[PDB]
């Protein structure tokens, strides 16, 4: 009988409760809800739950499969944590930790002073920006340590917690590079052009160095409150422009300090761009007191 070979992540649908829509993914839905006893010590836990549309294509379900699986093996304060999986019945439910304020792009946009949904507080300060950069870098460094290239780092894929901690999310495009330290895409596929490195666009190659390039664009998204990168140029135009050595300007009044990291991230030669650990190292001295307490950078694991 099957009962004697259970999945440790299986969770009873009975423990899950949906409250509202947190957003819509390209082929599923993300809901906010609470789950009864899914974490030892917590009677109830606020959570985000991802579903998959009946009409989801094989490819999409295959991408959804990878997302959940790579996550099963992560454990880092700056990475969205997987909590359980409901598969006994339909529809399948993937339960993750709730990031109260949603994705960074949305969040950033709400802080605009004219935003119809401004929460009542000023745009991110220099300090709050370094903190974000530092948290995204840490999570990513952890990811790199585990030997995984994300391939799709952007504001939309970064989440913001109730306490405002930013964490890496959406691991659908993630790939193991353990043996070769790189991933070379084969055929055709939906790629996030406006966030890709030149070598990745030219030869379809992905490294932690290309992920560093995306980080820079995320810094840019951050300092412009999530405007559109290469605003006014079609994906085909950007592709040609970047491969020719092109890159983004510094958003208006972008902090000098932030502009520097972007200069480093967009070096044409991938080997010259910095690594995430070096990025946390550059900012470690101007962060919340709790950082050394939860960062991967400060943990014994980082060896």
């Amino acid at each position: 009988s099957s009962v004697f070979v259970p999945d440790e992540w299986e969770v009873s649908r009975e423990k899950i409760t949906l409250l509202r829509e947190l957003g819509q993914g390209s082929f599923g839905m993300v809901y906010e809800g609470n789950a009864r006893d899914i974490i030892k010590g917590e009677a109830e836990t606020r959570v985000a739950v991802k579903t998959v549309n009946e009409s989801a294509s094989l490819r999409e379900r295959i991408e959804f499969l990878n997302e959940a699986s790579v996550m099963k093996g992560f454990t880092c304060h700056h990475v969205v944590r997987l909590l359980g999986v409901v598969s006994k019945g339909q529809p399948t439910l993937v339960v993750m930790e709730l990031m109260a304020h949603g994705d960074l792009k949305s969040y950033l946009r709400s802080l605009r002073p004219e935003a119809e949904n401004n929460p009542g507080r000023p745009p991110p300060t220099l300090q709050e920006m370094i903190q974000m950069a530092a948290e995204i870098a840490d999570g990513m460094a952890y990811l790199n340590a585990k030997k995984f290239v994300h391939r799709d780092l952007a504001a939309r894929n970064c989440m913001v917690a109730h306490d405002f901690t930013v964490k890496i999310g959406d691991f659908g495009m993630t790939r193991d590079i353990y043996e070769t330290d790189y991933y070379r895409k084969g055929g055709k596929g939906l790629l996030p052009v406006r966030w890709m490195a030149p070598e990745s666009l030219k030869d379809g190659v992905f490294t932690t160095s290309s992920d560093m390039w995306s980080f820079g664009v995320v810094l840019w998204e951050i300092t412009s409150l999530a405007e559109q990168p290469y605003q006014g140029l079609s994906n085909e135009q950007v592709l040609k422009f970047v491969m020719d050595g092109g890159y983004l300007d510094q958003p208006d009044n972008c902090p000098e300090r932030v502009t520097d990291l972007m200069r480093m991230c967009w070096q044409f030669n991938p080997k010259m761009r910095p690594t995430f650990l070096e990025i946390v190292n550059l900012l470690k001295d101007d962060l919340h007191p709790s950082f050394p307490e939860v960062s991967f950078f400060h943990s014994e694991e980082n060896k």
Binding site: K188, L190, K202
Partner: peptide, 13 residues
């Protein structure tokens, strides 16, 4: 769902 953020493609090289 930022669909516009993706382009169907194969390495130009």
């Amino acid at each position: 769902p930022a669909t516009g953020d993706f382009m169907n493609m194969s390495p130009v090289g």
